[PDB]
């Protein structure tokens, strides 16, 4: 029975020599013996809002998902395949769910390292199933179908919302299965779940500049739905593709011992 | 000709904001939702579990 729960639940008061009956964990049931029943309580009107634990609020933060510097005088630009698996902070927070449905939201933020020049950038989103530019100046950059976006450096950062791209109803975060239909296709990759390929170049023709452009791509996913939560991954990662596990040499977060030790259980 | 003026905090990128941005793919028909079991709509549903 679903019910709107805007605040955390209230506590009714409680009442000598009462005799409660029984319990069962082994059916798979979390025990719902109330704090009213097991111990003495009092009336608490509870006003703690549950809103910040919502699955929207838990994931709709603009995490930096890429930080790629390129030198201007791939070389001369960068193309980046979209995954949230880049940085381990956001991925573990997304490995808490099996199926995720969200609309992404890219915010490209550009700086210039070493009179600092003003340039115009192009951030073309090439979804998978199209052609990404190999060279800096292919004819793929003026492809009028791909949702390109032009933006300067000295202006607020460019920002575009990319919709839910998958042909399934949700991105399979984990994927117990194999891509394609042949036996050399890799494990844990769904071809359906690929977002696209965002690629950013500097539009200007070649300037005598001794300057480095550091580009940061942010992603605040929104309109988020989630399904089938998972145990959070405790061990350190070993790659972006597969969920291999190594463990550390000492506790905590080791293979033999996830929790750091103490003297004894009774000390 | 609306008379406007910029506040401080204009043109900033606040990495926790919530503003309707420009869509990349216009009139993109998304893949329709399908009732997948076990939807988490609040993370206290997970914390409730043994």
């Amino acid at each position: 029975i679903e019910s709107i729960i805007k605040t955390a639940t209230d506590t009714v008061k409680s009442e000598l020599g009462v005799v409660p009956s029984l319990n069962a964990v082994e059916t798979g049931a979390t025990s719902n013996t109330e704090p009213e029943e097991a111990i003495q309580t009092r009336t608490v009107i509870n006003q703690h809002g549950v809103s910040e634990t919502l699955v929207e609020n838990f994931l709709s933060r603009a995490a930096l998902v890429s930080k790629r510097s390129f030198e201007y005088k791939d070389k001369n630009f960068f193309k980046w395949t979209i995954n949230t698996r880049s940085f381990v902070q956001l991925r573990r927070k997304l490995e808490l769910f099996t199926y995720l449905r969200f609309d992404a939201e890219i915010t490209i933020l550009t700086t210039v390292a070493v009179g600092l020049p003003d340039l115009t950038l192009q951030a073309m989103f090439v979804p998978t199933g199209a052609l990404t530019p190999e060279k800096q100046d292919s004819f793929h950059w003026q492809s009028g179908s791909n949702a390109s976006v032009f933006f300067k450096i000295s202006d607020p950062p460019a920002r575009i919302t990319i919709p839910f791209m998958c042909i399934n109803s949700a991105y399979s975060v984990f994927y117990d299965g194999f891509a394609g239909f042949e036996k050399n296709g890799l494990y844990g990759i769904n071809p359906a779940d690929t977002i696209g390929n965002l690629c950013v170049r500097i539009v200007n023709e070649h300037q005598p500049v001794g300057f480095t452009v550091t580009v940061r791509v942010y992603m605040k996913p929104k309109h988020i739905k989630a399904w089938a939560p998972r145990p959070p991954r405790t061990l350190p990662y070993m790659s972006i593709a597969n969920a291999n596990y190594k463990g550390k040499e000492r506790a905590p977060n080791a293979l033999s011992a996830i929790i750091g030790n103490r003297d004894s259980v009774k000390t | 000709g609306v008379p406007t003026y910029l506040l401080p905090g204009s043109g900033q990128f606040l990495t926790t904001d919530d503003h309707s941005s420009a869509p990349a793919l216009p009139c993109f028909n998304p893949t329709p939702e399908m009732h997948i079991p076990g939807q988490v709509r609040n993370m206290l549903e997970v914390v409730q579990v043994e």
């Binding site: 729960i5 049931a29 719902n32 919502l54 929207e56 988020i224 | 709509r41 549903e45």
Partner: peptide, 28 residues
């Protein structure tokens, strides 16, 4: 939202409809 598309809108932080029972009591 002044964009024509619907996913372009701001986030919808209004889904307060819990159901904790479907994990704690998935029984019949």
């Amino acid at each position: 939202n002044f964009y024509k598309d619907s996913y372009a809108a701001s986030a919808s932080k209004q889904d307060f409809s819990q159901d904790p029972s479907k994990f704690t009591e998935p029984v019949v």
